[model samples]
Target chain A: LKPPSMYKVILVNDDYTPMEFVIDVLQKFFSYDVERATQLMLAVHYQGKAICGVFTAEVAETKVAMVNKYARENEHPLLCTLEKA
Target chain B: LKPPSMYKVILVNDDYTPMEFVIDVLQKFFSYDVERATQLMLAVHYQGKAICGVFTAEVAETKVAMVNKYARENEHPLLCTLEKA
Candidate 1:
């Protein structure tokens, strides 16, 4: 059977996380190199967060962990979280 | 030339990524101890950058790309670069 709606792992923006860095992540991980990523960030800038991409529930957790882990590595409070879609 | 001259890889410090995270990467990837990693992090902050390791030129580019890839994969710009030594 087709799976139910998957999780949307979102990137939460912050001041300390550089704009260029955010653009890089948006482009590299989620394949939002052009119109899509910029538009998404503009949304997140005012709104505070946006979906980077979607995945299965457990996979979402794993991916979120990965993002958080790297965020820590880079000393960023940048938070990527999970939501049902 | 000689299979590419050896190169050094450096880890850069940034405002967002966690200090502990940088320590973890240094230990996990480069085998730096906790205390040393701390010093290394500070060095990157004030001194410009910290060493990830030395490698043959080709390997330097390869690993720099890989580590950079890893950072992006995690959505963290734990920027890694290579230099001749």
Candidate 2:
């Protein structure tokens, strides 16, 4: 292969979901520590969106799928999408 | 006292996470199959929340923790909470 391709998984925000849940998700999924996760969650809360992480397109797509799957199962309307990065 | 007190673990609906994702979580955490998970998910979506299951308080708390942890690791803001049932 050539240069490693990268895509960013994004976390889109909405009102009803709790901030604590977002912070925890970032920590558990992205390996962000608690403080970093909290910051990221707050940033999204104020700004509406943020990149969850950058990975190979396949990885990004898998993450989007997995995240969406988890959210749906838990009954939250959170959205995760990917874009070339 | 008498019988062990039971608690209902609830999944609260939100506005950002995908519906399919919620269905997956119910399958994964609650051991619900496709039809049951989908029905519960619809109830949560249309009705705002639904009880995932009833268990002893400790069991219910663990399930809530596990679901929330899984959702966090997946970066979805899914909330799992419990109350006396």
Candidate 3:
């Protein structure tokens, strides 16, 4: 039997996108509560990036799309991308 | 009296993102059939852009994020955004 590829969806850091927006996206899209969202947002800010979630290929791809579009639509330059897990 | 603000998820035209990829995304993400995907792809190609779907603000926001990340993860410059409907 074969297993589907899983991917890590990472949020990349940028100077312009706000901390609050990142936290909001985490809660809204990734289902993180405010505490965890705040933690992850800090990681992205201080560490320069962090993995938001890990998901199978299709699911991961969709999550990335959702994050990217949400950021772009809101005029934030926040970036989300996936890599093999 | 409590209707949500709906938005249109639009696929934008670019010089480099491939037609086939656009068609595939339409099918995969927007639930379009091959024929409709091709038609929408062409519309973006010729008309500068086209609406892929209309959805409530939250749903539309999520969709745009999904499309944008999907494209970026694959190294395509395809852009998706939402606007008031």
lDDT of each: 0.75, 0.83, 0.89
Q: Worst ten-residue run, lDDT, model 1 chain A?
A: A15-24
Candidate 2 lDDT, tens digit per residue, A1-85? Answer: 0124689888998998888888767886888999888888887888899987898765678888887887888888888888888
lDDT of 1 by residue, A1-85 (tens): 9775699998886766655556656776676767787777766777888878888888888888877787788776777889887
Q: How does candidate 2 fare on TM-score?
A: 0.51
Which lDDT tens digits does candidate 3 get at residues B13-72?
999998999998999898999999998999999999999999878788889999889999
DockQ metric, candidate 3: 0.02
Name the better of 1 and 2 by TM-score: 2
Q: Kindly report the root-mean-square deviation of model 2 from the true structure over all alpha carbons.
A: 17.5
**Candidates 1 and 3, the one with greater TM-score:** 3
The Cα RMSD in angstroms, rounded to one decimal, for candidate 3 relative to the true structure is: 15.9
Top candidate, metric lDDT: 3
Candidate 1 stretches greater than 4 Å from native: B1-85
User: Stretches of candidate 2 above 4 Å error?
Assistant: A1-85
Ranking by TM-score: 2, 3, 1
lDDT of 2 by residue, B6-83 (tens): 999999987765676788899998889899998888888888899989999788888999989988987778788989
| TM-scores of chain B, in order | 0.77, 0.94, 0.95
